[PDB]
Amino acid sequence: MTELKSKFVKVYSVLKKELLHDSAFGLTDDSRNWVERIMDYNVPGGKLNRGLSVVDSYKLLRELTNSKYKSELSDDEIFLASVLGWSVEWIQACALVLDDIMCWFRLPKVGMIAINDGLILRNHVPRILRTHFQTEHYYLQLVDLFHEVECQTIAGQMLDLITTLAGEINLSSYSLPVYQQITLSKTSYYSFYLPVACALVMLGENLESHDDMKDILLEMGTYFQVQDDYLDCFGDPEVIGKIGTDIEDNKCTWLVVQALEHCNEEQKKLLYDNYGRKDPKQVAKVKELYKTLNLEDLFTQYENKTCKKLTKSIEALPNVAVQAVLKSFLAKIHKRLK
Amino acid sequence: ELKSKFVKVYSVLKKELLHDSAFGLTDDSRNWVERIMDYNVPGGKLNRGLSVVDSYKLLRELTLSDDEIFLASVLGWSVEWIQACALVLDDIMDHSHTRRGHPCWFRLPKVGMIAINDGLILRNHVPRILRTHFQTEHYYLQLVDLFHEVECQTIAGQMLDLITTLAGEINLSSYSLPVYQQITLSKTSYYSFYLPVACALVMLGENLESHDDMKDILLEMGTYFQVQDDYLDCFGDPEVIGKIGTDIEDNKCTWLVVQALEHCNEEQKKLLYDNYGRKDPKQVAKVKELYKTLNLEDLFTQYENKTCKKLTKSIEALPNVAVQAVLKSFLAKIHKRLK
């Protein structure tokens, strides 16, 4: 089960050798190994669905719009899309650098190591894009698109940092607006906007002519994160392949915030005294408070209403290839159990 | 005088950014963006941005169009935008206090989100400024590289500083010298000292990859500049500085606090835990008195004399006499300064 995905995976190794044995940025033999270890720990491995969606999207935009000379994707076409797909995976790798880190005094030294790891990787994307796109017309537009998503990611990463730290001293810091900003800037941009926007820039398109699609993808990114959060609570761990830890891990879950908005005083103090522990006695009291607040129903309500909104906004787009791409994104997420 | 010729450049750029066809904005959003813009970028001495133009002027002399000054000033004002973004988060602990100056925490992420999003707005101006005014030059890509380097180095430092300032409220042992050095270097040294000279240099038609030694000097000189800052906030003629030192009350990660924790023993360590990040002058004085007892006034004289001599030596070892002149100018205006 790999096909063009196997053809995609190889590109990481090509970019990695380029980045390491680059004359413009020399490296000690010890520097190279140190950088390569950071690269391999952080960037390859995983589902790769974000980077691949760049290639899958570029393939669907070409298949439908065309007006190019042939509809089959060139080997050089597949490769360049994969280079952007892997740039996406680098952006992603940087965004997650901090997600462990979690007593307190050991935290800034620990955090310092992680920050420098991402510093190394962040300085890779400009070089990747320059090596492989410096000559195209759209190069400057591509640098913009990446600068925007890169900068929005860093903002979301900083808020998630402030927020996950402030959550250890007071759960009331987790709020609905803050959750939406973290989800939007830290995740939605690279996850849903960035792939397709990459396919469009190399397809020879201007992004300022797709603001209606950019709002759709960003909202679809929020919807996707509300899904993950919900699944981490209850969703057949044998289907997901993972045990839910968000309630234990003291995460800023869509569930937790919707809880503290609807539940009051007595229910609120129940949550402070039971959220984020490791024995199931408190984990179940939480899961029961969510059931008491009907949060499975509030979620399923949110799901159908948001799906209707986006399908409407999608059916209302002028670009049939774009909407065909967004329709595949939305149906691949809808009511997914995994 | 040339300062007045430099300041209007801000208004030039501010007018460009707002009434950009490529970036439409409501009249009501434009006021909001302008309020963010001028609250954060102009005002203050503007010395970093000015050092770009003075540096270009000294480099050119030792090897002048009005438009030249404009472009140099455009880069100097670019520096001020970077400086602005680095500092957006610095009073995040005192603006979350919607009380007096008491613990908060729940109101902290809302406060931070505002700040983060302000700096996000200002961070998107530098690429537009550099493109508008340099898209066409030989060195344009060298400029985009240079600003991406410092921009990213700045971003790392504030992220570490954030982690550090938060973890410093709970458990004081979080403040350490390696963490202090990293923050000082990545958050500050890059934009303040490297970036100005590097701007004057790349526009002067130079490649930065052949100035690694000058860069190492400038970054270290930036760290030296911050250790001076920290030391003065404790004892440095509060009447001369024109400001009252607030660092001990504010529970800041000072070079001094770090050096104290290194030298002091468990009794002195507890004196520091039980005082320090408090308000009353009685507890603040126990610290400033503990600093004296640990000999941190002389330890500072050692760092300064050694860093000054060490850098003077490294600078004189540069082949480029024009570069040596600029770094010597920076070093001698920082040296033993009382304000």
Numbering used by the authors:
A (entry chain B): 1 to 102, 113 to 348
B (entry chain A): 3 to 65, 73 to 348
What does the paper say about this structure?
Prenyltransferases, also known as isoprenyl diphosphate synthases, catalyze the sequential condensation of a basic five-carbon building block (C5), the isopentenyl diphosphate (IPP), to synthesize prenyl precursors of isoprenoid metabolites and isoprene polymers, collectively called polyisoprene. Ultrahigh molecular weight cis-1,4-polyisoprene and trans-1,4-polyisoprene (TPI), which are the principal components of natural rubber and gutta-percha, respectively, are also isoprenoid metabolites that are assumed to be synthesized by specialized prenyltransferases. These prenyltransferases are divided into two major groups, the cis-1,4-prenyltransferases (CPTs) and trans-1,4-prenyltransferases (TPTs), based on the stereochemistry of the double bond formed during IPP condensation. To investigate the molecular properties of the EuTPT proteins, we determined the three-dimensional structures of EuTPT3 and EuFPS1 using X-ray crystallography.
The crystal structure of apo EuTPT3 was determined from two crystal forms with space groups P43212 and C2, refined at 3.0 and 3.3 Å resolution, respectively. All dimers observed in the two crystal forms were superimposable with a root-mean-square deviation (RMSD) range of 0.797–0.941 Å over 595–633 aligned Cα atoms. The superimposition parameters suggested that the dimeric architecture of EuTPS3 was highly conserved and unlikely to be caused by crystal packing. EuTPT3 also featured structurally conserved basic residues (Lys46, Arg50, Arg109, and Lys348) in the equivalent positions. Crystal structure of EuTPT3 showed that the residues Ile164-Ala165 contact with Ile164 and Ile125 of the neighboring subunit in the hydrophobic tunnel, suggesting that smaller side chains such as valine and glycine provide the wider path for the product that may contribute to the activity difference.
